[PDB]
Every structure is written in structure tokens, then in C-alpha cells.
Design a protein around this ligand. Structure first.
Ligand SMILES: [Zn+2]
Ligand SMILES: [Zn+2]
Lengths: 357, 10, 367, 11
């Protein structure tokens, strides 16, 4: 009862304890802190990702379904740290959103004004944190993504998800039906030499209808390997840790719209597939689906921890109106552009007017 | 989740 | 010290102590927690408003400028309460934004990932909280409002601000150069016709009428049931419009579009719009907030933060999630609607928002 | 107001 939040009366509670609680005839307690761990890049600590959430659901259901617990409330708990508490609460909220179809205001009401508060989530970069997203942001972002059809736990493949996250298999995530974010391949191209992660990426892309690869970082491989399997390769390079000029973003959004119209996927990489990649995919998600910047960051990190780094967060925050309202102030060009390899860029309403008269 | 318990919002 | 956040090395720190610290050769401490109080409506506890911030800045500057502190760092502090720590941190950030021209990422870096965290801000209503705004939201909202010319601490009149907030002087705030939010006047209006010149209005009602007459209010919008006779505003040439909807509910978007068009019509003439519901907080915040988002591109959270920085308690209960869920719509309307060329009886002959296709049609003679 | 403001520039 103490340090315990009611989610469903006599049914589901969220606790935070520095001791090990004892099951009683009315209560069963479980923590997953020893089983489901967030892998920190630097000082990021959460939120837990969709694979973690899927495994939490399996555990939760197994405990709920145990005959011995038929007449007990279930208390999911963490340790008392504000970081561990934030991860546990956010994961339980994501469970209710994705599995039980609760809405954000329903999962947020039990968490509001808890003392001590939950630690807000920070980015994965090395500079001191200066931007935070909350459980409220993550919940709204995951809910909106589910409502737009971008998350579907029915078809979610946990084994595929966990495998391809690994560096040795290419360090990538399918983010949505349209986008993959990945770390740059690396090779020593001779002046049969591809390493296992590169072959794994090429195989997956060939099997999963990737039609465009966008490279955002300095070259670490020869693009011919993607063109060898029929995939268009595009450089839109900008420097590590920086935010892309809006001219790059407009070119990227038009390239992506062009491929999506053909039914294809776009795979985007920078060095790590986190910051620069998050800028561009994030811009497109906001343009398409109307996420807030904080929701977009929360959804991206729920699928691929660490996306959008440092000042890129404030950049996405400050340009989110621009991206959303490009639906009204821009059009896809009628004319293909050599800057994006013959795909069609976003252009201003006025140029599109000229083209159309 | 096949046999997923019903935990409807309150 | 250890329980302390650095804002400027060797110059400005933010501490939290459940005791009174003693000044040292190198440190001067001060708090305002025991002199500048947030006046809670229910379980809201902050953020501190612009008037409190002005008072804080006067106190801070006096300490900064005292020669005894010339080679001392200043430690602004609160008690260890996560709520009081949030108020102090938010006020110091708002000070840096509004007096020292810092940007949001500059004031937020010192606060990020503090353990224990600051309590997020909740609304002033009676249901259990289900929506929070953060210092990050408030800071971005106050900064954006300053960048748009809606706040200027250098011309701010503390005496007028604090006076008119009082119930006995009308319980209102000028929110922006365009808008006033106020609580409904109340009167016992005589039911028959009387030839008497004598006034039956109470002091707060006269106070509202005099301020509105002198401050270019051209439209009063009433959102609650009738507690006064509108003739008192019409007597002084001020248009009066009902857009009433039930206490504690969110307005239909048809009401919002009518309001935005009515307000735009007045703004284009150069006038102010004064909006009230019963308290001038929830329903009034829905409609003014929608217009602010429509005009200036605030996020919903920023808009709520800014509104509460001027007038604590605005936007109540489910109205917060409603503003959050419709903020894209309000911005959309800049592109998808126009001010009607035909007046609508629903807003007293002002012009509502209509679709682009309706607008195109109104420029022709239907055949 | 706030010509009395000391200079406290961001770091
Ligand atoms: Zn090669
Ligand atoms: Zn009267």
C-alpha cells in the first residue's frame, strides 16, 4: 500500500521498494529489473524499448494467468531510484496503451504528481543534458504511432528485432513500414571481402523492399554494394552532431515521398543511425503524422534507443511547426532533381504553381 | 497475445 | 555547496535547504519562499507568475548590487520540497530568459537530470491530475511569448498587475496586447425599466468597466451563464458576444472557429478582446489559447505555461488534453481557413473562420 | 524598469 500506485483497483499496482516485498494471500509482487535491462550509450537510462515492452507483457501475462494468483492483485515494482521508477512506470503505461487500448489520459492519471517525481528521460549524447522528454511525451508518442498503424504488437517479431539491433548483424531497426534506421556499414573495399554485418544488412534490405539508401555521414564503404542489389544510393551528408539545413530536409522528404509512393522502404544511416538519422526521419514523421517533436523523439527512442542527439532535440522542437505545415506551404516537384538522384524534391507552393499553369 | 487477460481502463 | 545547481560559475547558484544557510566570505544566500507566495486555487502549486518574477528580480538585483556581495557567489534557494524547488528553479529560469536574454537551452542545461527531480506543474481543477507541464514547457512558452512581443518585463507595471488580479477590482489580467481574461462580473440587475441615473453596480464591475473603457476593449466574449446584464458593456460602446458552453467542458470546434474569427476581426481593427467565463480560467483559456496557438505557433504545453505565467490556473482538467490534441488543427487553420467575407449572426455580425472553398465562393454571386 | 540589472551573461 505504501509507495504504491493504483492502476486497477484490486488488480494492478505499481510499487517502488528498496526491500523485497513478500507475496500474501491477496497480493503477488514482481520486478523485472534483473531480467529486462536498458543498455545505456552514455547517461541515457530509458525509456524501455518495444522489445523490452513485449517481454514485459509475456511476463505480466504469465503472472496474471497463474492459477495461484486468480484472486490476487498484481504489484509490478522497481527499486526506489527515480530512473528505475520512470522506466517501470513508462513500460506499464506503454503496456496499457499497446495491449489494453487505454488512452494517454487514462494511463497518465495514476502517475501524475507522484512524490518523489520520476526522472525525465535524457538523450544519449556526451554533452550535458539540456532537453528532456517525459512519460507523458512517450505515452502520447507511442499512442499516436499505434493509432497511425506504425506499431503493431500482433505482427511484432521479437527475435528479428533483437537480432538486428546487434552490431554484428548490422545495428538497425525497422522503425515504421516506410523507414529503417541503421549504423553505417564499414568495409575495406579492394583496390570476397564484405564483413558479416554488411552482408546481413544487404540480405535484409534485398528481402524487405528497401528501394533507397540515404547516407548522412562520411564514407565508410563503397555504395556500389547497394547498387549491386538494385537499390538507389543517395548521399545527403552533413557533419556529425549538427542539424541539417532545411534544404537537405526538403530534399530528403521529397526523396522519401517519391519512394513511398512506389511502395518502397527508405533505409537511412549516419555513423550510428541515431542523431542525424533521427533528424531526417523525425522531420518526415512530423510532416506525415503530426507528432509533436517530443512525441516523435519518444516514439523513435521506443523503437531505437538513443535517436536524436543533443542540440538536434531543440532543433526538432523549434522546427516542428515548419515540418507539419509543409503539407500546406510546399508541394512535391513535378520535375525530378539531380540532387536526389532523379527523385522529386519538395518545393515551395509558388514554384509548383509555375510548373502547373 | 492469445490468452491476454482483460484489463480494461477504469 | 553540494545540494546546489550552478547557473554561472562563481556567481549564481540554486540551492535547496531545509535549514537557513549562513552567509560566508564567498557566498550570500537568499530565499523568497517565505515572502513571495503562490496563491493556490486547489492543488496547483506553481509556476510563480510574472508579478512574482518582477518582485524576485528586484530582490535579486539588490543583493547582486550590494557592495558586500561584490566578490561573492549568490545562492538563491528554497526548502527541499520538490514543489518549492520547481517554483524556485522555474522563476530563476524565467528571470534569465526575460532579464538576461538567455535562451531556453541555456537555462535548461543546469536543471536537467537533477536528482531528486522537480515536481511537474499540475492544473487548478478538482479532478485528479492527468496532465503535467514541465519547466521546459514554461520556459519555452515564456521565451516564445517574449520573442513575439507579448511580454516585456521592462515596461511591466507591477502595481496595475497586482491590483486588477484582486476580486474587488475585477479579477482580470491583460494577457497580451490583444487579450484580457477576467472572471464574470456579477450584479443584481433590476428587472423593470427605471429612469434613475443612479448606479447599482458593485465596485469590481465599475473597475472592469472603467479599465475596459480606457484600454481599447472593443469586444467582451462571455462563455458562462448570465450573471450580469450585457447592457452595461454596450452602454459604453463595447460589443458583447455570448459563446457559452458548460463549465468544465471543452468547446466544440465550431465555437472555437467562431471565436478565432471574432477575435481576428477585432484585432484587425486594432482593438482588444476581453474574455470571461465564471472564473476566467478554464473555458477562457481554451479559446484564448487556441487563438495564441493559431497566431504564434506555441505548442499546447507552452501555451498553457505562458497563460499560467500571467494568470495562474488557466486551462483546467480535461481542457489540457483537449488543447494538446487539437493544437495541430489550430495551426492548420492559418492555411485551411479564411476570415469570412459574410457576417454570421452566431458572432454578432463579426466574421467567422470559413473554409478556403467557402471563401472562394463568397467572392461570387451564386447563380 | 531593469536598467538596474547587473550583467549575467550565459556561460
Ligand atoms: Zn566492397
Ligand atoms: Zn445592471
Amino acid at each position: 500500500l505504501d509507495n504504491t500506485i493504483e492502476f486497477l483497483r484490486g488488480r494492478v499496482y505499481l510499487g517502488a521498494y528498496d526491500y523485497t516485498p513478500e507475496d500474501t494471500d491477496e497480493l503477488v509482487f514482481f520486478t523485472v529489473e534483473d531480467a529486462i535491462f536498458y543498455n545505456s550509450f552514455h547517461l541515457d537510462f530509458g525509456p524501455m524499448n518495444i522489445g523490452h515492452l513485449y517481454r514485459f507483457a509475456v511476463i505480466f501475462h504469465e503472472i496474471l494467468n497463474d492459477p495461484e494468483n486468480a484472486n490476487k492483485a498484481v504489484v509490478f515494482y522497481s527499486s526506489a531510484s527515480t530512473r528505475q521508477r520512470a522506466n517501470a512506470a513508462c513500460m506499464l503505461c506503454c503496456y496499457m496503451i499497446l495491449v489494453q487500448a487505454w488512452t494517454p489520459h487514462q494511463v497518465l492519471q495514476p502517475l501524475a504528481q507522484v512524490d518523489p517525481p520520476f526522472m525525465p528521460f535524457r538523450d544519449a549524447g556526451y554533452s550535458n543534458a539540456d532537453f528532456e522528454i517525459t512519460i507523458q511525451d512517450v505515452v502520447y508518442g507511442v499512442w499516436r504511432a499505434k493509432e497511425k498503424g506504425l506499431i503493431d504488437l500482433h505482427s511484432f517479431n521479437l527475435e528479428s528485432y533483437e537480432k538486428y539491433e546487434h552490431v554484428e548483424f548490422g545495428d538497425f531497426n525497422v522503425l515504421t513500414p516506410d523507414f529503417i534506421a541503421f549504423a553505417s556499414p564499414q568495409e575495406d573495399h579492394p583496390k570476397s571481402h564484405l564483413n558479416q554485418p554488411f552482408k546481413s544488412v544487404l540480405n535484409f534490405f534485398a528481402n524487405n523492399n528497401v528501394q533507397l539508401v540515404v547516407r548522412l555521414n562520411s564514407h565508410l564503404y563503397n555504395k556500389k554494394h547497394f547498387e549491386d542489389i538494385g537499390i538507389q544510393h543517395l548521399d545527403l551528408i552533413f557533419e556529425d552532431g549538427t542539424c541539417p539545413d532545411l534544404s537537405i530536409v526538403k530534399n530528403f522528404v521529397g526523396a522519401a515521398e517519391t519512394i513511398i509512393k512506389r511502395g518502397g522502404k527508405i533505409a537511412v544511416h549516419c555513423k550510428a543511425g541515431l542523431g542525424r538519422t533521427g533528424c531526417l526521419i523525425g522531420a518526415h514523421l512530423i510532416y506525415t503524422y503530426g507528432f509533436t517533436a517530443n512525441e516523435c523523439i519518444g516514439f523513435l527512442r521506443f523503437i531505437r534507443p538513443g535517436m536524436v542527439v543533443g542540440p538536434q532535440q531543440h532543433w526538432l522542437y523549434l522546427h516542428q511547426n515548419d515540418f507539419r505545415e509543409w503539407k500546406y506551404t510546399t508541394r512535391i516537384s513535378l520535375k525530378p532533381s539531380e540532387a536526389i538522384g532523379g527523385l522529386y524534391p519538395l518545393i515551395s507552393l509558388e514554384e509548383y504553381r509555375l510548373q502547373k499553369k | 497475445f492469445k490468452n491476454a487477460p482483460l484489463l480494461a481502463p477504469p
